[PDB]
Enzyme design. Sequence first.
Site, PDB file in Angstrom:
ATOM      1  CG  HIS C  69     -12.117  11.445  10.929  1.00  0.00           C
ATOM      2  ND1 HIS C  69     -11.763  12.746  11.222  1.00  0.00           N
ATOM      3  CD2 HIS C  69     -12.141  11.359   9.576  1.00  0.00           C
ATOM      4  CE1 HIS C  69     -11.576  13.416  10.096  1.00  0.00           C
ATOM      5  NE2 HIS C  69     -11.802  12.598   9.082  1.00  0.00           N
ATOM      6  CG  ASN C 141     -11.544  17.592   8.213  1.00  0.00           C
ATOM      7  OD1 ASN C 141     -11.711  16.891   9.216  1.00  0.00           O
ATOM      8  ND2 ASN C 141     -11.514  17.084   6.979  1.00  0.00           N
ATOM      9  CE1 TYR C 351     -19.280  11.957   5.756  1.00  0.00           C
ATOM     10  CE2 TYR C 351     -18.809  12.055   8.107  1.00  0.00           C
ATOM     11  CZ  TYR C 351     -18.475  12.367   6.798  1.00  0.00           C
ATOM     12  OH  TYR C 351     -17.340  13.088   6.511  1.00  0.00           O
TER      13      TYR C 351
HETATM   14  C1  HEM Z   1     -16.365  12.133  -0.275  1.00  0.00           C
HETATM   15  C2  HEM Z   1     -15.488  12.351   0.719  1.00  0.00           C
HETATM   16  C3  HEM Z   1     -15.680  11.780   2.143  1.00  0.00           C
HETATM   17  C4  HEM Z   1     -16.300  10.656   2.530  1.00  0.00           C
HETATM   18  C5  HEM Z   1     -16.957   9.571   1.648  1.00  0.00           C
HETATM   19  C6  HEM Z   1     -16.227  10.585   3.977  1.00  0.00           C
HETATM   20  C7  HEM Z   1     -16.740   9.584   4.770  1.00  0.00           C
HETATM   21  C8  HEM Z   1     -16.653   9.531   6.147  1.00  0.00           C
HETATM   22  C9  HEM Z   1     -17.253   8.517   6.978  1.00  0.00           C
HETATM   23  C10 HEM Z   1     -18.115   7.359   6.423  1.00  0.00           C
HETATM   24  C11 HEM Z   1     -16.942   8.778   8.254  1.00  0.00           C
HETATM   25  C12 HEM Z   1     -17.375   7.950   9.495  1.00  0.00           C
HETATM   26  C13 HEM Z   1     -18.745   8.430  10.003  1.00  0.00           C
HETATM   27  C14 HEM Z   1     -19.204   7.594  11.174  1.00  0.00           C
HETATM   28  O1  HEM Z   1     -19.075   6.350  11.133  1.00  0.00           O
HETATM   29  O2  HEM Z   1     -19.705   8.168  12.172  1.00  0.00           O
HETATM   30  C15 HEM Z   1     -16.123   9.979   8.267  1.00  0.00           C
HETATM   31  C16 HEM Z   1     -15.592  10.610   9.372  1.00  0.00           C
HETATM   32  C17 HEM Z   1     -15.341  11.961   9.424  1.00  0.00           C
HETATM   33  N1  HEM Z   1     -15.171  12.813   8.323  1.00  0.00           N
HETATM   34 FE1  HEM Z   1     -15.577  12.360   6.397  1.00  0.00          FE
HETATM   35  N2  HEM Z   1     -15.570  11.707   4.437  1.00  0.00           N
HETATM   36  C18 HEM Z   1     -15.224  12.468   3.334  1.00  0.00           C
HETATM   37  C19 HEM Z   1     -14.563  13.678   3.346  1.00  0.00           C
HETATM   38  C20 HEM Z   1     -14.559  14.521   4.434  1.00  0.00           C
HETATM   39  C21 HEM Z   1     -14.439  15.968   4.431  1.00  0.00           C
HETATM   40  C22 HEM Z   1     -14.259  16.842   3.162  1.00  0.00           C
HETATM   41  C23 HEM Z   1     -14.471  16.382   5.712  1.00  0.00           C
HETATM   42  C24 HEM Z   1     -14.415  17.817   6.289  1.00  0.00           C
HETATM   43  C25 HEM Z   1     -14.910  18.889   5.652  1.00  0.00           C
HETATM   44  C26 HEM Z   1     -14.642  15.216   6.556  1.00  0.00           C
HETATM   45  C27 HEM Z   1     -14.734  15.230   7.931  1.00  0.00           C
HETATM   46  C28 HEM Z   1     -14.931  14.125   8.736  1.00  0.00           C
HETATM   47  C29 HEM Z   1     -14.933  14.164  10.171  1.00  0.00           C
HETATM   48  C30 HEM Z   1     -14.721  15.395  11.076  1.00  0.00           C
HETATM   49  C31 HEM Z   1     -15.202  12.741  10.627  1.00  0.00           C
HETATM   50  C32 HEM Z   1     -15.304  12.274  12.089  1.00  0.00           C
HETATM   51  C33 HEM Z   1     -16.674  12.670  12.633  1.00  0.00           C
HETATM   52  C34 HEM Z   1     -16.617  12.318  14.094  1.00  0.00           C
HETATM   53  O3  HEM Z   1     -15.781  12.925  14.821  1.00  0.00           O
HETATM   54  O4  HEM Z   1     -17.388  11.418  14.511  1.00  0.00           O
HETATM   55  N3  HEM Z   1     -14.696  14.095   5.745  1.00  0.00           N
HETATM   56  N4  HEM Z   1     -15.962  10.412   6.961  1.00  0.00           N
END
Ligand code: HEM
Lengths: 514, 513, 514
Positions: C69, C141, C351
Amino acid sequence: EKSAADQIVDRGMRPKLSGNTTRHNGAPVPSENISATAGPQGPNVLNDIHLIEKLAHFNRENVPERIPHAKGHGAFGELHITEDVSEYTKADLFQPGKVTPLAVRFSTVAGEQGSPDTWRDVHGFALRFYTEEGNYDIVGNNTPTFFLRDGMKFPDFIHSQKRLNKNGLRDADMQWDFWTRAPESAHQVTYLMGDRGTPKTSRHQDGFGSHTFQWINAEGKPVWVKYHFKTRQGWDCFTDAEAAKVAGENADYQREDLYNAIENGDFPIWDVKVQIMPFEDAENYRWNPFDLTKTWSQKDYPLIPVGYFILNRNPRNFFAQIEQIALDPGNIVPGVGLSPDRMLQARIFAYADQQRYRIGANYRDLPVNRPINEVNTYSREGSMQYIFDAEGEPSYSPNRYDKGAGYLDNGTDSSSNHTSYGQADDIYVNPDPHGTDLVRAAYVKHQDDDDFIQPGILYREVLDEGEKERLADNISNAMQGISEATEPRVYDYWNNVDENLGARVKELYLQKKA
Amino acid sequence: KSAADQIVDRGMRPKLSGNTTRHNGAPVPSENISATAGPQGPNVLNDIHLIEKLAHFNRENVPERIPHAKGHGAFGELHITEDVSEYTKADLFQPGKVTPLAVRFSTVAGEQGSPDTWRDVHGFALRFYTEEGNYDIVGNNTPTFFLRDGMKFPDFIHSQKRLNKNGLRDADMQWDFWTRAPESAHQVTYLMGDRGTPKTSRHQDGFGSHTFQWINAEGKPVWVKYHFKTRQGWDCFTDAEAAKVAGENADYQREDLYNAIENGDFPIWDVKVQIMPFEDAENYRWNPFDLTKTWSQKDYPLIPVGYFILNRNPRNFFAQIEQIALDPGNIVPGVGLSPDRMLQARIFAYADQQRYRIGANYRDLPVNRPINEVNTYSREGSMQYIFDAEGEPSYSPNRYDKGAGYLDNGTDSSSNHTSYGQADDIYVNPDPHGTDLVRAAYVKHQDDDDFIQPGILYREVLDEGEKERLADNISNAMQGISEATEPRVYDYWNNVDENLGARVKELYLQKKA
Amino acid sequence: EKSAADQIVDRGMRPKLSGNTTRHNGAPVPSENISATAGPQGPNVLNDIHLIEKLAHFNRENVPERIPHAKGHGAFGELHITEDVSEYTKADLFQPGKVTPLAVRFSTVAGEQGSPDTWRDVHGFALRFYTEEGNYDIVGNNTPTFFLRDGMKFPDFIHSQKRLNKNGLRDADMQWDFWTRAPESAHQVTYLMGDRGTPKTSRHQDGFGSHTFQWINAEGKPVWVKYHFKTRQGWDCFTDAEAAKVAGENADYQREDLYNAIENGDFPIWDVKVQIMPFEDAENYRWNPFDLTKTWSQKDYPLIPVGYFILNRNPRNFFAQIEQIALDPGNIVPGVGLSPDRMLQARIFAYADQQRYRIGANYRDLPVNRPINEVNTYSREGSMQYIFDAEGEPSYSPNRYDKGAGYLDNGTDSSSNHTSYGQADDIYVNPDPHGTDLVRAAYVKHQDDDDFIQPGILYREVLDEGEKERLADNISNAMQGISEATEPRVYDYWNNVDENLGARVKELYLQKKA
Ligand code: HEM
Ligand SMILES: NC(=O)C1=CN([C@@H]2O[C@H](COP(=O)(O)OP(=O)(O)OC[C@H]3O[C@@H](n4cnc5c(N)ncnc54)[C@H](OP(=O)(O)O)[C@@H]3O)[C@@H](O)[C@H]2O)C=CC1
Ligand SMILES: NC(=O)C1=CN([C@@H]2O[C@H](COP(=O)(O)OP(=O)(O)OC[C@H]3O[C@@H](n4cnc5c(N)ncnc54)[C@H](OP(=O)(O)O)[C@@H]3O)[C@@H](O)[C@H]2O)C=CC1
Ligand SMILES: NC(=O)C1=CN([C@@H]2O[C@H](COP(=O)(O)OP(=O)(O)OC[C@H]3O[C@@H](n4cnc5c(N)ncnc54)[C@H](OP(=O)(O)O)[C@@H]3O)[C@@H](O)[C@H]2O)C=CC1
Ligand code: HEM
Ligand code: HEM
Ligand SMILES: [Cl-]
């Protein structure tokens, strides 16, 4: 050694592995698919060691991208000397018959990682030669000139080419507001807004050192030089519309082109040439020879052949060898020196500085950044120190042991008792400074020095009618979005380059303003 | 009440009671028990407070300074009581001015846990929060120093720290370096005397050490040296006493300063300068820009300027002292540099380490922000807390009003061959004595060598007890040197003074079993 | 005509400044245009303090982008509660009449921070509510489901969507090799390959919490919930070809759209709704209610209105307030709990782990990440500590002073003597774990649980004929470049979803291949 670069590119690479995965301590991984819970529907446990290790390293994959030139790609190859330039330089890599491993990285300037290769922009053209007297980098661009003549202004230019602070959008008004208020930019903006602002590939463009550098021969005699890397593939450029179309089809069009070409055995080649200006010619040349915004006329100083380089090896691992390469114009070697180009002198500081942050204090120790000869240094410690000196070796000089000191020193004392070494030719043999005081001053004014003559000459004497028309069309496209305050500044800027170009730019601009 | 109060309150939370919260502000269930899947079951991954608490704990430490890791400080006020406006236009030094200050004191070689009372130079680093920016005088408790070229600074500092093989400090290394860099003799003589072991931070002078420049309203320069003369007076341990206290209280001086201020016993220093007319420089008996050379107070007596007082302890030691970023490059109008190569290297080095030790945005931390608004085109970087007003330009020259340099016109890039002339804000330079980039000696003045000044100290200034203690201290410090280093050290001290050298060797041999 | 988020959005912003620039110590800058040299033609001096400071901080502007992202943008606004849900949750922000400031970031997933907004991809939809009981983030999402049901596999999926190690190129073979060998992906891949894989803007898409969460009322009674954010602007999608064309015209199309919309007073709104599944319904639902790859049928659990949110404030500074925002599903508050969704449980760790690295140990203290209530914590020190506790407050608990401890604790001791607190409802009221051991196990198998029935239902019962054809066309386009080893695995994967979809995919693929 089916490329001379094989010794370099194989550094750090694991053998191929099979069977089952292991954790980072080497113990077997139970699953890459299922995490451990307290009951099948119970909570995930803290002590799924592999899970946490896998997620935590994943969380740390990214590192700061370069500013500027974040979007880039490269290859490895060989420099081959075919002429005798020994009367001009003692630099080891440039001696007759020498074959030297190289790395290269090409890039755009303003866009981030992931941004399209074919946005209109300058393209980076940055070489490392792994010489027997150390890594010599020539960090050039695909243009013989540049937008500015003082490093104080470099971050202003680069913010203006990047994104507005409020909303993260690049902005036409900001780009033109800066350029028109920094009219020294005229020469390079004319080059940038022409066909060459959109080369189709990294293979189909020339490379240049841009700066005046110095060569010094075995007897300590200096000459001023400019490097020119002339593509055997030839210049080949998209139109403005074609480049934008390719940007949407393949944002990595140039990265992919270079990979495919080398994979298919179609190894690109550039002829290495220099302009050579005798030390005694400098003061009276029609243009200041150290002003980056001024090219040396090839009618006055024709290209002299040195040899060629060929790109014949793709990297083994892109991140480890290209993202982490630390190219630096301050990586000079004996027989090569600098010049009173204030942009160059700022660069000599700036690259290693960013690299200590972007990569780490010990970035020089990474496989792609180590020279082929052994480094003998008193530097020590720092984050992630992989390499260290022989056990018990001294950490300080002068010392009573044998590790050594500088080649000017005696290795046994601090050069007190009023010891002097004389002119620092290894930096460069300087010309007259024209003053005895610390100053903020203009460059020494030569007869034909101004901000507009050279791009005017390009337009009037070099460009064909098609090139002239596309230039005007490109410019007027680039102007879309400027404020009403900025419009007359832009009209004036182009009129100062050439009144006919300026008239046509405005004509097309008003047509499109709709 | 203290003038430093507005500075020292920046960033401090109000006192809080009741119950703890996570870092998102939600209530913490327990600080005592972690969540498990059954009482004897495994710990669950999602005890959010547990992981947050452990993870931030894991990240408490930051790189200590190199050198001067072990230190401690306070806040206070500078008061001007004399008129020096004929010499400098620096705002903080104008008649009647009162300026908030910070200070950090330190040793040099030891790490964060090491004792305050190891024999060492002590750092004496001041920040003045002036109306024209933060002006730091990062000084030491000595008027001179070991070297005259920054190229040699990491060599000296490694030699004072630990061997690469085993992590032990080493007498042989210290003396091998000192004797092969004989420019060190002036400061080594000072270091090995009584003043190598001052009892407290309050009972020592401070000095700017380097020659700096002062420039008045009309642009006329003079060379100056700073002297901060302690009203508490010098008071030193013997070698044996300092070593004993080092084990009894590793934080003797840190505790002493905090206690003095808590008890209202505010330490005071009188601020004085030596002033050398610009035209005096070339013909002075010693090179006036060589750090290893002091200016004789018979030639240039101390001229009073004012005093400073320390009347405020930090609210939080780590936030305000460990994170302070003191920097000799923090100069202000009315103050300039000099052709002292040590000084010129320092102007680069401090901000360089601070960008790493603290972070790219270290300047935005409460203790590091000046009292006036910063107007900069710098942006972004890790942990950007402070940012410019919405929509302001990121580049100059621009078509808006954020502005540019005072030499610039605010509308263009100063092309068309615009020149500004002499960079007096850096310093009004003397003759460079050459037109080429060179590696050269300093200009040689009549009495310049590595030994004459510490010899004069020994022969003409030190009393009989001081001379004897000096030889005793040196011979103690020599214990452990290799046989290959002994004769080099004997000769070194003979070069200072033949009677000192004889006595040093005599005592050394006595103590050598 | 302002915003409830103004209190947040103004934190850390300087007043407007004029006159002349100053260095970072506050002293006046002599020039932004010309650097200092020893003579006009002499070398640059080391002690141009402003030059070095300006270049050095320029050199440190970049920070690691998010993985994944990286490419996103956002805004601020207000959540308005319009219905009474207090029977289900005691969460403060959801109580009747509550208006709560918010931040939002939208994003793509795979591409880096310069990449086009309109590459086919899932889009992030991540909200922060600045509630009186702390920051509550719903990091969702634009899809009600996702590709996996175990966090162990997340880094595998994300590498497969990013770039090959050897050459830095994204790769169709890799994407399909992973999807087909991890067939749990089928539900979300069908969603991704449909029209919704290319929404036109951030405003013209729904948002979802995706996971099952828990609501707990004042009496401690739990229910299972899913969040739905229904766009008032309506879904509006590009075709595959239109999305690529836009990517070339404007890589920041969606970033620019949201900025322009808010600038113009056209504030986008979403209605906030939930599905609510009684605690007693969970075990006997036709699908596993905690499996992220399974949606709850809206026939079984209709949407229940809660309120709406509106975006009515653009950021003052994009980098400071959007790039540095640390959105985190672990930011829950009283009245909200987790669930046995293994993906969610892994996210609760991941996160904040990344943010500690990406931003810094003290990222929580940055203006956009601080809650509106006072943080009472024993955490201390760490890099760049801006905020610190009141002078002399204790660093440890239990202590003899007043700073306090947890609400379950007594504030005086360590809770020894065998003190127990009981069920950790603040994490979640758990259902039966279906076992007593640490295991690696399948999810509890419900009647209709498989990897293919739900997207099959979508295709057979939901999609219109044009949607069904575009889906097959999009899929076949995305297959171009896969190896012959991968082709039959993809044919079979699509047959598992639906035999007719499968046949058409193969038909169009073979047509386009040549
Ligand atoms: C076990 C599965 C997942 C892991 C380990 C994971 C991990 C991460 C991490 C580490 C980040 C970066 C956070 C940061 O540095 O600020 C991220 C971004 C993001 N993830 Fe997840 N993610 C997973 C699944 C999902 C799911 C299921 C969704 C939605 C329901 C999701 C939605 C998002 C969104 C929207 C961002 C961007 C947030 C922003 O705009 O700053 N992810 N993900
Ligand atoms: N080193 C230099 O002096 C260079 C100068 N120029 C420009 O050419 C002008 C004349 O220089 P001088 O050496 O006296 O003249 P020359 O006639 O000897 O060479 C002109 C140069 O311009 C290049 N050129 C041709 N088309 C374009 C274009 N579309 N955009 C940018 N460059 C192009 C030529 O490349 P080619 O031979 O392939 O046609 C050639 O290198 C200068 O004002 C400068 O702007 C450009 C490149 C290098
Ligand atoms: N800036 C300077 O000129 C200083 C020079 N020095 C040393 O003094 C020598 C003569 O300088 P000059 O100013 O001409 O002579 P002065 O007589 O005018 O002053 C001599 C200085 O030496 C100081 N001093 C006394 N005892 C010791 C000691 N134990 N260790 C270090 N310093 C001590 C004096 O302090 P006090 O008056 O309190 O007794 C005084 O500051 C120099 O060679 C130099 O080594 C030392 C300090 C300052
Ligand atoms: N949380 C959920 O239950 C959702 C499920 N889905 C999919 O719908 C299927 C049926 O679920 P159920 O709720 O029982 O049936 P419903 O008829 O009650 O709802 C079907 C859902 O599918 C959405 N939809 C319409 N077109 C598309 C498309 N082009 N791509 C993706 N989604 C689209 C609808 O949005 P709209 O009303 O605006 O037409 C609606 O939300 C499921 O298998 C699932 O794949 C999709 C969205 C939400
Ligand atoms: C004073 C002016 C300039 C300054 C301060 C400057 C500074 C920098 C810095 C700090 C980097 C990042 C280096 C890294 O992190 O590895 C960079 C990248 C780069 N610059 Fe410069 N630059 C200047 C002008 C120029 C000029 C004139 C050229 C060409 C002659 C040039 C060519 C490049 C190239 C090719 C790269 C990318 C190298 C790579 O591919 O890794 N720059 N610049
Ligand atoms: C060229 C020689 C020198 C170099 C390169 C140098 C460099 C440094 C550096 C990088 C630091 C750490 C700064 C930080 O991280 O905040 C430091 C600490 C310090 N140095 Fe220097 N130094 C030199 C000589 C001197 C001299 C001559 C003096 C006194 C006149 C001095 C006084 C101090 C003091 C007082 C500190 C600690 C400041 C504090 O308390 O935070 N140093 N030195
Ligand atoms: Cl750094």
